[PDB]
Amino acid sequence: STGSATTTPIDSLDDAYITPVQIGTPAQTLNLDFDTGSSDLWVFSSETTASEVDGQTIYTPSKSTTAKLLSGATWSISYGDGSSSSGDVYTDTVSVGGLTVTGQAVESAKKVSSSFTEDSTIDGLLGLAFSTLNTVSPTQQKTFFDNAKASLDSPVFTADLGYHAPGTYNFGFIDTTAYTGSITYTAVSTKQGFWEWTSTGYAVGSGTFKSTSIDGIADTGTTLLYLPATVVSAYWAQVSGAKSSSSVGGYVFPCSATLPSFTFGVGSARIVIPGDYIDFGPISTGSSSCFGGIQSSAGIGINIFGDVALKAAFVVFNGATTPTLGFASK
Template sequence: MRLLNAIGCCTLIASASCLVVVAVAGGAIKIPIHKNIHYRQNTRARAYKTLKKYGHHQRLSPRDFGHQPVTDVENDVEYYGVVGIGTPPQMFKLDMDTGSSDLWIPSMKCDHDGKCARHSRFDSSLSSTVTELKTPWKIAYGDGSTVSGHLAIDRLEFSEITIENQLIGLADRESSSFLEDVVDGVFGLGFPSLSAMVLEDQKDAEAKVLGPISNTVLSSILSHELIPAPVFGVWLGDGDGEGSDANGDDGEFIFGSIDTSRFEGELTFLPITHSRYWQVQVDGAQLDGIEDLSIKGDTIIDTGTTLLVFPIAQAKKINKAIGAKSDPWEGWILPCDSNQGGSLDFRMGGNLFSVRRKDLVREKVPKQEGWCYSAVTTTPGNTIIFGDVFIRNNYCVFDVEHMTIGIAPVKRRHH
């Protein structure tokens, strides 16, 4: 087994080539992940939001996904981390997202007839360390929905780590999908090539803050100089919905190390197939250890996605195998009392990684007694996306140095 351990307390003093980062607790940095206590499932909304994120939603026909309009529901966000920005720190609930790369939060300019005020907004006048820039920033989605504003540089704090001069997007305007989210913003953990934040003059900006700027969170915290190892592990609970662990956490991201108490057996490390995303190869799939579903292709391991997303033909094959049907109004649905004792297994790196059948059955379909939504949904693109449904069943390690993802079954408290 390839194991990356924390190797002690790491403290660095600012120089011309490093950021100021202080890590304690044995060198490993843990960020507790919290469940939204008002969470309620909305499979159609989460599927649509994922397709918007990857720019595929407009290519679906009504029969592929469902004819009725889909909107985000306020309570349909399950996990978030709490981070501080500024001096003194202002606290924000952020989506810890391996499928994007930027850190952004709402600014005080964000209003939208008072809708922004339901979120925490960053007040620059209260931070003694902020440097606001005139550089505009914008993320645009396929349907024209956007988050836009201006860039700033300030202090970032999460768990037991502090990063000086972190580049931050201050959102002055947000589309309705973001306004209706429970989270305040996004904490991107993807590769720098995905970043939408570009400084027009990096040297000029660094002269203003008298030091180097961290353009993405990943580049600042996952270098050998800043933490014991350029790696982070993700655990989203034990998958049984039994509540928090002994420390009161519903999940965690751990930087600089991995937590061997969270998984069974050994990690299988898979090479990244494309450095734009945390993306690995799926070599096959089977149902209940018997039926070969002939599923192959690249899959993005995305903590910012809820469901399992497949190209149309593959989604159809899996859903039919688990007993689901395509409803012209609701998309893929299956009997709520479907066989929940088996598993859907994916072959990667010569090993099988499972998603339990019970986790493929989502919330009840309105006005269709006995029918529930399927956790397997459709994209017209070619890429598979494994969201939280997969990650709750499998501990995932994101290794920057070796450009791999390590996966192992989660350890469950109840068998």
């Protein structure tokens, strides 16, 4: 089998992407944030504290003839941005782009933190990291990809995120029309539960390539590109007036600037992030200070190849017995 679904930016900045997901019988369609950096499929629901729902579409398990309470199971997750959610668990039928999994754990939120409530466009998350990170207790549950894998034509999914435009998540096949050149595959460590890999270096604008190993994670659920402070300083030093602002929480730059590109290495291959992809717009409405799309990872503990990086590529998440990642230009 295969599946193919369009993913759409939630706003004019590409702060996140939503993909429609069918849950239950009859189908209830929710728009979920596909997140290769986490491993829980959780949704706003009829169980979510009413004051914490503000415009989201909810899953109502009592209206699904295939929903079953997973007795005794609870979940609770905290994300790198400080947000969190928790609740109980059903199993139900879940379909993405024509690919159907029966018995998928659907984690129903009883509580969500304020940032989730405040984002009316995201109805939940669909985790695509390794199932060892799934938070369901006392019996850990499998991701949608893990459940579908054996049925897929090939044990892969691909992320093709757009810049200010829709893109595609495919399951079970590699669309050879969706990229240019060849796909360069690189090794993955699953030891932390992430799609963790090592970039071979970087360049700023038209500058020379610096060969240096940068271990990080391919994370569709993180907006920005988080890299070591040395790399980030070298990038922003090429932008007149750019500075790190403790009060804003990262590098800012004059909105009048034209940003240089940023290149990252994948083996001997190179992925170029155009400068425009690094502009996240005014720090507050009407400000002439703009927020940068490349930020330091120094306070995180891990480097994160988030959407800013991934949307410059066609990305293969290869879930073969030994997982690997593939990157192609597009």
